[PDB]
Design a binder for this molecule. Structure first.
Ligand SMILES: Nc1nc2c(ncn2[C@@H]2O[C@H](COP(=O)(O)OP(=O)(O)NP(=O)(O)O)[C@@H](O)[C@H]2O)c(=O)[nH]1
Ligand SMILES: [Mg+2]
Length: 166
């Protein structure tokens, strides 16, 4: 079957792993549990296509940048995740995008901008600004909550659809 190699990237603590686990295991990890590198594989049906999601969950930490090149290079699609209550994470997005373009030798890699933690009242990043950014990239912006599961399948399935259209 078709396999889709999705990579989840972003700053430390934005909820990359919480999003992935919510997708694969339908629960919200409300734990402190920093990632080094995790992989998940799940057979799904998306729009009637039987396929395998190969999801690489990456570290937000600066120390793991080398293994970051390695993982990025094999990815077909990237979820670029920030937290809507953390302005630095949103600013860091630019640098993850640029590193993906560099390792992939590509200006237009399948990608979704994901604004996570939208369940939180204490927003510092407006939806308007994140949308403008995504528009300037030529990529969809999806807002998610790993906690309530809002937008979770949306973000992953939209990325699969971007890979199909590439
Ligand atoms: N309210 C809320 N909290 C969330 C959400 N997603 C993650 N969190 C919380 O934020 C913290 C970090 O999430 P986690 O999934 O470990 O983030 P990460 O990006 O994988 N961290 P790392 O880069 O270290 O692997 C956890 O305590 C988690 O419960 C969300 O959508 N809403
Ligand atoms: Mg993690």
């Amino acid at each position: 079957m078709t396999e889709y190699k999705l990579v989840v990237v972003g700053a430390g603590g934005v909820g990359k792993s919480a999003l992935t686990i919510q997708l694969i295991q339908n629960h919200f990890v409300d734990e402190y549990k920093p990632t080094i590198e995790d992989s998940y594989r799940k057979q799904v049906v998306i729009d009637g296509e039987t396929c395998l999601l190969d999801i690489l969950d990456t570290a937000g930490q600066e120390e793991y940048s080398a293994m970051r090149d390695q993982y990025m290079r094999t990815g077909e699609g990237f979820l670029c995740v920030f937290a809507i209550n953390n302005t630095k994470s949103f600013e860091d997005i630019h640098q993850y995008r640029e590193q993906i373009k560099r390792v992939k030798d590509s200006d237009d890699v399948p990608m979704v901008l994901v604004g996570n933690k939208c369940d939180l009242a204490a927003r510092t990043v407006e939806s308007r600004q994140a949308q403008d950014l995504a528009r300037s990239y030529g990529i969809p912006y999806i807002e998610t909550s790993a906690k309530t599961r809002q937008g979770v399948e949306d973000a992953f399935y939209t990325l699969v659809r971007e890979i199909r259209q590439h």
